[PDB]
Specification:
The structure is a homodimer.
Chain A lengths: L1 H5 L4 H14 L3 H15 L20 H19 L4 H16 L5 H4 L3 H9 L5 H15 L3
Bound molecules: protoporphyrin IX containing FE (2 copies).
The site of one protoporphyrin IX containing FE has 18 residues of chain B, from helix 4, helix 5 and helix 6.
Chain lengths: ~140, ~140
């Protein structure tokens, strides 16, 4: 249940998400591409899903990958901005969930983004505490897949 | 090209876009839904394209319409944030262009959004000067359709 998942976002979790986002969200192009390249490096079996982006190994030099990465960061921005109202958070999550359901992405495969997020956070000096907070937000999307 | 259309956006136009967005973008749920409902009210022929959203006459109550409307405002947020770097504005514009190309939305049809944008701007007392600035930004997307 996406509603039960959203209920797991306690005051402390919401605070950790906001505090860490203030840093990671400050460079959407840089961190967005970092997230994607890490996903492809640690989970090469997911590359096939991104056929439209072309050669993803080119990273930042790939115009389609850069546009996608920046856009992805705005989806995360949308989640953070909706933390105050669970009903609005849910409708935004379900919108993006549909984008992945049509792509045949399961809850388990979507969860593969947790590794990259933990690594990007760590590179900015945000440890397991923050990684776990983000895993709970990702869990809300998983509940809708 | 799309690059040419973006590189032409002048300092004065960027200023008007940013000043008006400070206001219209401060209530994404409210103004996003207003934009969509105005589109359906003045251009009833477009309703059929949004069948995935269900009964759009339900307005704010329709969670799918609310989710779509909020997310649409973040696409505009992405455009505004990239105004000073045409290279980044272009790759983001092309990303959202593909979303509409797949739905068979023509450049002319995309331009139907100008009416609703003008009305929403007017509700906040932003005149023709601002409506003209937004039409120029919309034209950047049209260059990609
Ligand atoms: C933090 C989690 C993630 C967020 C917020 C996110 C967000 C997005 C957004 C906003 C889009 C564009 C939707 C569209 O225009 O169609 C997208 C596309 C896509 N996503 Fe994700 N995504 C995430 C994780 C994943 C993961 C882990 C996978 C794969 C295992 C995945 C697979 C896809 C695919 C295949 C596309 C289509 C790309 C294309 O052809 O343009 N996403 N995602
Ligand atoms: C300011 C201009 C507009 C922006 C920024 C915009 C943005 C978006 C975004 C972000 C999506 C979601 C993409 C996806 O998840 O696949 C979308 C979907 C769509 N847009 Fe637009 N759009 C605009 C104008 C229009 C206009 C004027 C039309 C048609 C006359 C249109 C028709 C569509 C359709 C049919 C969809 C698919 C909805 C669905 O089934 O979920 N858009 N748009």
């Amino acid at each position: 249940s996406v509603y039960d998942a959203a209920a797991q976002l306690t005051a402390d979790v919401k605070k950790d998400l906001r505090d860490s986002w203030k840093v990671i969200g400050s460079d959407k192009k840089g961190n967005g591409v970092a997230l994607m390249t890490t996903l492809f490096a640690d989970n090469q079996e997911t590359i096939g899903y991104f056929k439209r982006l072309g050669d993803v190994s080119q990273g930042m030099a790939n115009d389609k990958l850069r546009g996608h990465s920046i856009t992805l960061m705005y989806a995360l921005q949308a989640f953070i901005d909706q933390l105050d109202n669970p009903d609005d958070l849910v409708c935004v999550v379900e919108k993006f969930a549909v984008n992945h359901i049509t792509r045949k992405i399961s809850a388990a495969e979507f969860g593969k983004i947790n590794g990259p997020i933990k690594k990007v956070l760590a590179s900015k000096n945000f440890g397991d505490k923050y990684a776990n907070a983000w895993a709970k937000l990702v869990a809300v999307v998983q509940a809708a897949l």
